[PDB]
Amino acid sequence: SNAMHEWGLSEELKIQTKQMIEIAEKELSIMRNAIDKEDECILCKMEDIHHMLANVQTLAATYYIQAYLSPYTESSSFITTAIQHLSARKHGALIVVERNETLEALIQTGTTLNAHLTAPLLESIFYPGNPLHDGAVLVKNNHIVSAANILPLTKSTEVDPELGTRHRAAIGLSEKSDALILVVSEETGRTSFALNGILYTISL
Amino acid sequence: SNAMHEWGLSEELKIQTKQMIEIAEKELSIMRNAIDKEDECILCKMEDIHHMLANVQTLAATYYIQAYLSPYTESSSFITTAIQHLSARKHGALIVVERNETLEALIQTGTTLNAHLTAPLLESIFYPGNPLHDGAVLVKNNHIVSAANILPLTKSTEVDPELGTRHRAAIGLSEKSDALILVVSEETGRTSFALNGILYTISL
Amino acid sequence: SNAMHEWGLSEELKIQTKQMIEIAEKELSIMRNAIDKEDECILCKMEDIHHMLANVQTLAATYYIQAYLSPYTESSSFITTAIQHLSARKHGALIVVERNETLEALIQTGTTLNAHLTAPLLESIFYPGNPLHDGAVLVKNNHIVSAANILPLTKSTEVDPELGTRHRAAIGLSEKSDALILVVSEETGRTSFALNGILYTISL
């Protein structure tokens, strides 16, 4: 896509994120002053602030997906839709998005697809119990290159010791390349991505 | 602010600067040919060419403030207004704009403000004789972090020997960080900024 | 010359190039399936695919000229026009476009022009037999600095051995600087540019 245009879009998402942070800061400041007043109970404001922080999380995640992926794929909306659906169903998923660095020496290929990337196809691949669900999907731009791929697992001792093999594979690949690797937990439906050896929670 | 949009603005200011230089170049070429003619006296064109060069200086200064500061503050117009007012009154001023590098280990804090940045406040801080005028203001994006700050002074021998402590503090901080430091001289009202160990005259 | 705007234009040329490649890819897949049908003769599609490939070549060349030259000159359309005309007439040409690095220590000046760059002037310089045709033109932004210049010749043993002195001078200068050097062959009218020690065929 047009990198100049996409840069503008990234920048506007960043603006929106900062604006929700400012909204939350303002509401906390109001609460901090209101608690001193006998005719106020700041408990009535907690739902509002929780939602404000949920919005911060959503906007920031949208920002980083756009900033990190827009130069490398035109399919981020399709990927995000698939991820949301998989999360809701608690279907484990592991989606590698190739970036500037080539990955064929780091990934052991399961089944080659070279398919048009769509959300239904991503969701079908990760349906529990099916032949292609166990392992990683590789995405290059707007194609699903392959599925059921084997990735290197992090051996980092700075573990989150509760992390399963899906998460460790994302982290492990992200340590050896500039790939961004999305994970959906089969246990909780929590969605994450790994980039440069670090796992980040996202809410999409 | 939107970096893509701001880049376009920077680039247009650069275009305008180049255009003023071309205008000046053209007028000089006219003058150079006209002097040979006994029915011409090129002295009549000198005020025009002085003005053209004044415009070059103003456009270039606007260009560099925009290019160097726009990624790091949305308050450059407020800062510029304050500087213009301070210059006209010959009120000494020293304004640090934090850029990519953090400055807390390099600046000894005077008084913490954490204030909304406005021109009246900057101008009030630097009103001669007042408790906050002696030392530097620190700006981070759209906040005045602090005032009356102490900066490291350059010990360089290659700098103008007639430079006071305000100018040496600007140069000094600029040698240790990527901060841009604006100065208004209390002696002449001349406005400068230091960046990367070099002091540049500006006219706003 | 607004770099933000020019970046957008480069990016759109890239998009157009990718789209022509997709068109060619699609036609080939059609042909690959059609050959199995004995009521089809895929020879009728060869002209089409040849044209498609010619379009890929044209779009890609336009993209690279734009991406490599737009930050350094506003005269690329004039240069392209001159090159097209010289190519058609099979008039040898060698045009250095100065980029980020200065070239005065690497180029031995023939005749200094410091002229407004226009296509008629470039074409006049390289008219066969004339005083200025033998050697390189140097372009800095929108000026023809000089002509009949002498450039260093590549010593590279890994070159094409059928390359004449024009092509070797282009390659040679491109090894010592970031200049882009356009060549028109006097033998065939083939147009190339050298960049960083590599010669690329262009069609425009």
XYZ file of C-alpha atoms in Angstrom:
612
model
C 0.000 0.000 0.000
C 1.047 3.670 -0.115
C 3.560 4.053 2.746
C 3.055 7.869 2.888
C -0.706 7.387 3.301
C -0.221 4.534 5.813
C 2.190 6.682 7.827
C -0.524 9.331 8.127
C -2.971 6.630 9.295
C -0.542 5.289 11.880
C 0.035 8.825 13.128
C -3.687 9.466 13.527
C -4.113 6.243 15.557
C -1.281 7.467 17.791
C -3.129 10.772 18.185
C -6.343 8.919 19.135
C -4.432 6.809 21.660
C -2.922 9.911 23.333
C -6.391 11.502 23.413
C -7.895 8.551 25.329
C -4.983 8.625 27.767
C -5.705 12.350 28.339
C -9.408 11.577 28.894
C -8.471 8.974 31.535
C -5.942 11.307 33.225
C -8.615 14.016 33.396
C -11.193 11.671 34.938
C -8.699 10.477 37.587
C -7.903 14.083 38.433
C -11.644 14.795 38.877
C -11.993 11.731 41.117
C -8.984 12.770 43.249
C -10.582 16.152 43.950
C -14.141 14.784 44.354
C -13.299 12.279 47.115
C -12.885 15.178 49.590
C -16.557 16.139 49.212
C -19.080 14.568 51.628
C -21.854 14.789 49.009
C -19.833 12.702 46.534
C -19.053 9.011 46.288
C -16.354 8.397 43.673
C -17.368 4.733 43.390
C -19.954 5.894 40.837
C -17.039 6.780 38.480
C -15.119 3.474 38.479
C -17.015 1.881 35.584
C -16.288 4.984 33.461
C -12.521 4.854 34.178
C -12.266 1.099 33.606
C -13.883 1.652 30.194
C -11.531 4.566 29.449
C -8.551 2.322 30.156
C -10.073 -0.454 28.018
C -10.268 2.130 25.206
C -6.608 3.114 25.742
C -5.677 -0.581 25.404
C -7.775 -1.028 22.249
C -6.447 2.135 20.572
C -2.819 1.397 21.410
C -3.111 -2.159 20.087
C -4.675 -0.887 16.851
C -1.862 1.662 16.606
C 0.947 -0.876 16.996
C -0.606 -3.419 14.617
C -0.847 -0.630 12.003
C 2.649 0.748 12.657
C 4.411 -2.635 12.775
C 2.484 -4.419 10.012
C 1.268 -1.848 7.472
C 4.603 -1.738 5.564
C 4.552 -5.533 5.233
C 0.967 -6.598 4.650
C -2.263 -5.162 3.305
C -4.219 -7.791 5.214
C -4.081 -6.531 8.808
C -7.861 -6.028 9.038
C -8.512 -9.629 7.913
C -5.906 -10.897 10.390
C -7.434 -8.790 13.218
C -10.931 -10.090 12.420
C -9.711 -13.696 12.483
C -7.886 -13.043 15.794
C -11.004 -11.529 17.419
C -13.091 -14.529 16.333
C -10.497 -17.032 17.504
C -10.105 -15.213 20.840
C -13.859 -15.266 21.512
C -13.981 -19.029 20.840
C -10.746 -19.631 22.801
C -9.147 -21.358 19.797
C -5.356 -21.464 20.083
C -3.648 -19.686 17.199
C -0.133 -18.791 16.119
C 0.278 -16.435 13.169
C 3.701 -15.318 11.913
C 3.737 -12.146 9.841
C 6.948 -11.930 7.820
C 8.474 -8.461 7.891
C 11.826 -7.277 6.447
C 13.649 -10.529 7.191
C 13.215 -13.760 5.284
C 12.224 -16.803 7.418
C 12.703 -20.037 5.445
C 15.837 -21.081 7.361
C 14.094 -20.553 10.720
C 10.717 -22.184 10.061
C 10.193 -25.861 9.349
C 7.287 -25.983 6.903
C 4.229 -28.110 7.699
C 1.835 -27.862 4.765
C 2.277 -25.339 1.924
C -0.882 -23.422 0.958
C 0.235 -20.280 -0.933
C -3.418 -19.197 -0.426
C -5.325 -15.952 -0.580
C -5.471 -14.678 3.002
C -9.013 -14.329 4.323
C -10.417 -14.436 7.838
C -12.556 -17.566 7.226
C -9.433 -19.442 6.062
C -7.346 -18.384 9.076
C -10.233 -19.385 11.353
C -10.642 -22.731 9.580
C -6.908 -23.522 9.940
C -7.097 -23.033 13.730
C -10.357 -24.894 14.366
C -9.563 -27.298 17.233
C -8.865 -30.910 16.272
C -8.418 -30.339 12.506
C -5.291 -31.487 10.569
C -3.768 -27.948 10.300
C -4.373 -26.497 13.777
C -1.167 -27.696 15.512
C 1.626 -25.252 14.607
C 2.108 -21.819 13.041
C 0.649 -20.116 10.034
C 3.102 -18.049 7.980
C 1.758 -14.912 6.275
C 3.673 -13.040 3.571
C 1.846 -9.868 2.619
C -1.624 -11.052 1.487
C -0.911 -14.803 1.265
C -1.031 -17.619 3.783
C 2.215 -19.299 2.716
C 1.875 -22.363 4.953
C 0.312 -23.761 8.132
C 1.202 -26.281 10.862
C 4.747 -24.853 10.780
C 7.384 -25.536 13.474
C 9.099 -22.481 15.018
C 12.122 -22.337 17.351
C 11.098 -22.168 21.023
C 12.620 -19.567 23.327
C 14.948 -21.013 25.956
C 14.889 -17.705 27.878
C 15.045 -18.207 31.656
C 13.298 -14.835 32.121
C 10.218 -16.987 31.405
C 6.682 -16.270 32.249
C 6.754 -19.854 33.623
C 3.037 -20.368 32.867
C 3.718 -19.858 29.110
C 2.868 -22.772 26.834
C 4.624 -23.821 23.633
C 2.562 -21.508 21.361
C 3.777 -18.486 23.305
C 7.354 -19.750 23.555
C 7.426 -20.354 19.780
C 6.285 -16.801 19.078
C 8.916 -15.420 21.433
C 11.527 -17.802 20.019
C 10.999 -16.795 16.410
C 10.880 -13.095 17.374
C 14.397 -13.433 18.893
C 15.912 -14.628 15.593
C 14.139 -12.328 13.140
C 12.112 -9.143 12.843
C 8.908 -11.164 12.316
C 5.825 -10.173 14.327
C 4.039 -13.272 15.730
C 0.443 -13.152 16.953
C -0.789 -15.655 19.551
C -4.283 -16.585 20.763
C -4.296 -18.614 23.983
C -6.404 -21.796 23.885
C -6.625 -21.581 27.689
C -7.999 -18.025 28.044
C -8.471 -16.453 24.601
C -5.926 -13.764 25.504
C -4.326 -12.286 22.398
C -0.638 -11.316 22.228
C 2.148 -10.618 19.777
C 5.848 -11.246 20.054
C 8.348 -8.790 18.602
C 12.118 -8.791 19.178
C 12.033 -11.273 22.069
C 9.198 -9.549 23.940
C 5.588 -10.688 24.343
C 2.929 -7.939 24.399
C -0.715 -8.356 25.379
C -3.182 -6.888 22.911
C -6.925 -6.472 23.078
C -8.413 -6.304 19.566
C 0.875 15.872 16.006
C 0.662 13.948 12.733
C 4.302 13.499 11.657
C 3.332 12.902 7.976
C 1.401 16.193 7.930
C 4.183 18.039 9.816
C 6.771 16.722 7.347
C 4.745 18.242 4.506
C 4.693 21.547 6.403
C 8.450 21.454 6.984
C 9.002 20.710 3.310
C 6.831 23.640 2.233
C 8.766 26.010 4.525
C 11.961 24.751 2.871
C 10.400 25.500 -0.541
C 9.513 29.046 0.570
C 13.050 29.606 1.870
C 14.556 28.444 -1.452
C 12.151 30.747 -3.314
C 13.223 33.816 -1.277
C 16.876 32.981 -1.969
C 16.117 32.760 -5.724
C 14.411 36.151 -5.566
C 17.493 37.654 -3.858
C 19.853 35.954 -6.360
C 17.828 37.379 -9.253
C 17.836 40.929 -7.845
C 21.624 40.779 -7.373
C 22.015 39.661 -10.979
C 19.863 42.598 -12.131
C 21.947 45.023 -10.047
C 25.200 43.552 -11.467
C 24.048 44.255 -15.032
C 22.395 47.631 -14.247
C 25.551 49.240 -12.770
C 27.124 49.519 -16.251
C 24.317 51.846 -17.361
C 24.992 55.550 -16.787
C 21.222 56.219 -16.582
C 20.979 53.905 -13.575
C 22.052 54.167 -9.953
C 21.847 50.787 -8.222
C 21.774 52.420 -4.779
C 18.008 52.657 -5.269
C 17.797 48.829 -5.023
C 19.721 48.337 -1.771
C 16.751 48.543 0.618
C 14.895 45.949 -1.531
C 17.833 43.502 -1.373
C 18.313 44.027 2.392
C 14.615 43.169 2.817
C 14.961 40.070 0.627
C 17.818 38.807 2.791
C 15.783 39.620 5.927
C 13.040 37.396 4.468
C 15.562 34.603 3.738
C 16.628 34.711 7.413
C 13.028 34.676 8.696
C 11.946 31.795 6.443
C 15.033 29.716 7.176
C 14.530 30.235 10.925
C 10.855 29.242 10.670
C 11.922 26.201 8.631
C 14.486 24.960 11.149
C 12.279 25.533 14.217
C 9.568 23.471 12.475
C 11.929 20.684 11.283
C 13.845 20.368 14.586
C 10.916 20.838 16.998
C 7.689 19.596 15.378
C 8.331 15.920 16.227
C 8.782 16.858 19.892
C 6.331 19.623 20.692
C 3.029 20.975 19.488
C 3.785 24.315 21.146
C 6.355 25.847 18.750
C 4.072 28.756 17.801
C 3.553 29.680 21.491
C 7.315 29.379 22.109
C 7.998 31.556 19.013
C 5.519 34.247 20.151
C 7.071 34.343 23.620
C 10.589 34.605 22.120
C 9.570 37.465 19.814
C 8.091 39.371 22.762
C 11.101 38.687 24.967
C 13.473 39.745 22.177
C 11.661 43.067 21.603
C 11.870 43.893 25.326
C 15.482 42.650 25.524
C 14.559 40.245 28.350
C 17.126 37.474 28.697
C 15.672 34.004 28.218
C 16.874 30.426 28.104
C 14.409 27.764 26.942
C 15.352 24.072 26.685
C 13.162 21.975 24.407
C 13.590 18.286 25.228
C 13.864 16.182 22.095
C 14.638 12.443 21.825
C 16.973 12.284 24.835
C 15.945 12.659 28.498
C 17.634 15.427 30.437
C 17.069 14.813 34.153
C 20.680 13.748 34.840
C 22.007 16.847 33.028
C 19.752 19.595 34.412
C 19.670 20.682 38.058
C 16.045 21.550 38.719
C 15.159 24.988 40.075
C 11.402 25.111 40.641
C 9.056 22.420 39.281
C 5.946 23.759 37.525
C 4.540 20.931 35.337
C 2.442 23.742 33.784
C 0.436 24.194 30.615
C 2.781 25.977 28.200
C 1.508 29.392 27.067
C 3.267 32.511 25.792
C 2.160 34.696 28.758
C 3.628 32.153 31.215
C 6.982 31.916 29.408
C 7.111 35.705 29.282
C 6.213 36.002 32.967
C 8.976 33.539 33.970
C 11.596 35.675 32.201
C 10.430 39.119 33.364
C 13.624 40.734 34.733
C 14.081 40.756 38.496
C 11.420 38.099 39.271
C 12.187 34.954 41.348
C 12.145 32.601 38.299
C 14.057 34.589 35.661
C 17.595 33.402 36.512
C 18.208 30.077 34.763
C 16.566 27.805 32.191
C 13.025 26.779 31.485
C 12.565 23.114 30.516
C 9.814 22.287 28.010
C 8.576 18.750 27.379
C 6.042 18.701 24.555
C 3.255 21.086 25.700
C 4.309 21.502 29.349
C 6.727 23.820 31.101
C 8.339 21.214 33.334
C 10.424 23.625 35.407
C 12.178 27.003 35.515
C 15.314 28.563 37.030
C 17.153 25.355 36.056
C 20.969 25.053 36.015
C 22.578 23.705 32.825
C 26.197 22.633 32.170
C 28.262 25.480 30.671
C 30.412 24.801 27.625
C 34.136 24.866 28.383
C 34.918 25.106 24.648
C 37.625 27.570 23.569
C 36.347 27.729 19.952
C 33.223 29.709 20.942
C 32.740 33.491 20.769
C 34.620 35.003 23.777
C 31.953 37.712 24.223
C 29.314 35.061 25.081
C 27.600 35.240 28.467
C 26.537 32.397 30.751
C 23.080 32.075 29.118
C 24.681 31.339 25.755
C 27.354 29.075 27.248
C 24.658 27.093 29.119
C 22.703 26.579 25.907
C 25.808 25.454 24.046
C 26.848 23.332 27.027
C 23.586 21.386 27.254
C 23.526 20.951 23.462
C 26.939 19.190 23.598
C 25.632 16.526 25.998
C 22.195 15.839 24.489
C 20.028 16.329 21.398
C 18.051 19.090 23.144
C 17.455 22.343 21.258
C 18.060 25.399 23.486
C 16.671 28.824 22.601
C 18.377 31.950 23.942
C 17.333 35.625 24.055
C 20.227 37.955 24.897
C 19.455 40.500 27.623
C 22.090 42.828 26.066
C 20.871 42.988 22.460
C 17.626 40.976 22.201
C 19.325 38.729 19.616
C 17.683 35.324 19.495
C 19.639 32.090 18.987
C 19.378 28.355 19.459
C 22.023 25.823 20.320
C 21.945 22.383 18.765
C 24.734 19.777 18.900
C 27.340 22.187 20.287
C 26.699 24.930 17.729
C 24.961 28.277 18.266
C 22.775 29.602 15.441
C 21.357 33.105 15.156
C 17.675 33.214 14.338
C 15.323 36.072 13.590
C 11.635 35.404 14.264
C 10.227 18.898 -4.340
C 8.017 18.573 -1.272
C 9.554 15.250 -0.112
C 6.287 14.123 1.573
C 4.363 14.644 -1.689
C 7.141 13.024 -3.781
C 7.171 10.006 -1.456
C 3.444 9.545 -2.075
C 4.137 9.727 -5.826
C 6.933 7.165 -5.617
C 4.673 4.876 -3.608
C 1.888 5.119 -6.191
C 4.315 4.214 -9.015
C 5.340 1.174 -6.948
C 1.660 0.213 -6.633
C 1.204 0.555 -10.417
C 4.283 -1.606 -11.018
C 2.942 -4.334 -8.683
C -0.441 -4.171 -10.425
C 1.114 -4.733 -13.868
C 3.100 -7.667 -12.484
C -0.179 -9.145 -11.146
C -1.816 -8.685 -14.558
C 1.070 -10.593 -16.211
C 0.970 -13.328 -13.542
C -2.779 -13.785 -14.110
C -2.451 -13.987 -17.909
C 0.307 -16.621 -17.547
C -1.886 -18.746 -15.263
C -4.725 -18.445 -17.836
C -2.323 -19.594 -20.562
C -1.087 -22.499 -18.390
C -4.638 -23.811 -17.948
C -5.725 -23.044 -21.544
C -3.004 -25.122 -23.256
C -4.744 -28.357 -22.175
C -7.808 -27.500 -24.262
C -7.509 -28.530 -27.914
C -10.052 -25.856 -28.899
C -7.424 -23.332 -27.738
C -4.079 -22.231 -29.162
C -2.206 -20.136 -26.600
C 0.015 -18.612 -29.282
C -2.746 -16.023 -29.745
C -1.913 -14.648 -26.260
C 1.852 -14.140 -26.689
C 1.630 -10.561 -28.030
C -0.489 -9.618 -24.974
C 1.936 -11.110 -22.424
C 4.923 -9.502 -24.192
C 3.174 -6.103 -23.928
C 2.363 -6.726 -20.241
C 6.030 -7.418 -19.557
C 6.975 -4.280 -21.499
C 4.588 -2.351 -19.219
C 6.170 -3.898 -16.095
C 9.568 -2.722 -17.370
C 8.293 0.809 -18.094
C 6.517 1.197 -14.733
C 9.476 -0.157 -12.755
C 11.933 2.177 -14.514
C 9.653 5.175 -13.870
C 9.398 4.082 -10.226
C 13.160 3.840 -9.697
C 13.966 7.127 -11.489
C 11.370 8.788 -9.218
C 12.534 7.072 -6.002
C 16.274 7.576 -6.634
C 16.175 11.075 -8.161
C 13.181 13.001 -6.738
C 15.015 14.075 -3.553
C 17.883 15.464 -5.635
C 16.387 17.043 -8.725
C 13.105 18.524 -9.882
C 14.136 17.946 -13.491
C 13.599 14.184 -13.921
C 10.852 14.585 -16.534
C 13.149 16.779 -18.697
C 16.018 14.294 -18.264
C 13.650 11.392 -19.163
C 12.423 13.235 -22.284
C 15.994 13.932 -23.429
C 16.981 10.290 -22.797
C 14.001 8.981 -24.805
C 14.939 11.240 -27.727
C 18.622 10.341 -27.608
C 17.753 6.631 -27.377
C 15.498 6.819 -30.453
C 18.260 8.535 -32.460
C 20.921 6.189 -31.016
C 22.989 9.148 -29.780
C 25.469 8.144 -27.085
C 24.888 9.996 -23.828
C 26.299 9.973 -20.312
C 24.421 11.994 -17.668
C 25.573 12.146 -14.036
C 22.933 13.186 -11.516
C 24.559 14.385 -8.299
C 22.824 12.969 -5.239
C 23.897 13.274 -1.567
C 27.668 13.209 -2.194
C 29.684 15.972 -3.904
C 31.645 14.985 -6.989
C 34.242 17.688 -7.751
C 37.218 15.561 -6.603
C 36.058 12.634 -8.779
C 35.118 14.386 -12.027
C 37.575 16.201 -14.262
C 35.630 19.157 -15.685
C 35.427 19.609 -19.456
C 33.474 22.805 -20.098
C 31.510 24.644 -17.383
C 27.959 25.687 -18.351
C 26.030 26.317 -15.101
C 22.953 26.281 -17.417
C 19.222 25.908 -16.950
C 18.527 22.213 -17.585
C 16.137 21.639 -20.489
C 15.664 18.656 -22.774
C 16.705 20.568 -25.945
C 19.999 21.541 -24.256
C 20.803 17.986 -23.111
C 19.998 16.712 -26.602
C 22.143 19.417 -28.211
C 25.134 18.536 -25.972
C 25.027 14.886 -27.124
C 24.462 15.520 -30.832
C 27.111 13.338 -32.534
C 30.210 15.113 -33.811
C 29.712 18.350 -31.812
C 32.351 19.873 -29.467
C 30.561 18.776 -26.233
C 29.375 15.252 -27.027
C 32.489 13.329 -25.889
C 32.257 12.922 -22.090
C 29.718 13.272 -19.274
C 27.185 15.923 -18.403
C 26.955 16.735 -14.686
C 23.514 17.712 -13.356
C 23.022 19.321 -9.936
C 19.301 19.701 -9.210
C 17.924 21.844 -12.076
C 21.257 22.939 -13.600
C 23.612 21.420 -16.129
C 26.842 22.179 -14.284
C 29.219 21.055 -17.027
C 29.707 18.780 -20.047
C 32.470 16.806 -21.764
C 33.519 15.728 -18.244
C 35.918 12.826 -17.574
C 34.809 10.150 -15.072
C 36.829 7.278 -13.506
C 36.425 3.999 -15.421
C 35.578 0.805 -13.552
C 38.430 -1.729 -13.304
C 35.942 -4.447 -12.325
C 36.764 -7.790 -13.947
C 33.218 -8.962 -13.103
C 31.610 -6.609 -15.672
C 30.090 -7.277 -19.079
C 33.174 -7.381 -21.395
C 31.124 -5.946 -24.294
C 30.738 -2.647 -22.353
C 32.220 0.486 -23.908
C 33.880 3.415 -22.158
C 30.576 5.281 -21.580
C 29.173 2.374 -19.597
C 32.451 1.769 -17.761
C 32.611 5.465 -16.749
C 29.072 5.322 -15.385
C 29.831 2.177 -13.401
C 33.178 3.667 -12.346
C 31.702 6.860 -10.913
C 28.869 4.929 -9.244
C 31.492 2.866 -7.306
C 33.040 5.970 -5.719
C 29.881 7.954 -4.964
C 26.122 7.754 -4.544
C 25.629 9.518 -7.916
C 23.160 7.990 -10.368
C 24.570 7.906 -13.923
C 22.324 7.533 -16.977
C 23.744 6.059 -20.191
C 22.416 5.881 -23.770
C 24.369 3.461 -25.957
C 25.451 4.895 -29.323
C 25.441 1.324 -30.717
C 21.917 0.185 -29.809
C 20.123 3.102 -28.122
C 19.718 0.953 -24.998
C 19.315 3.142 -21.922
C 20.813 2.222 -18.534
C 21.724 3.776 -15.214
C 24.568 2.920 -12.879
C 24.080 3.062 -9.130
C 26.494 1.764 -6.486
C 28.629 -0.227 -8.943
C 25.694 -1.904 -10.705
C 24.355 -1.191 -14.201
C 20.562 -1.451 -14.689
C 18.721 -1.507 -18.009
C 15.800 0.890 -18.187
C 13.042 1.263 -20.761
C 11.190 4.587 -21.071
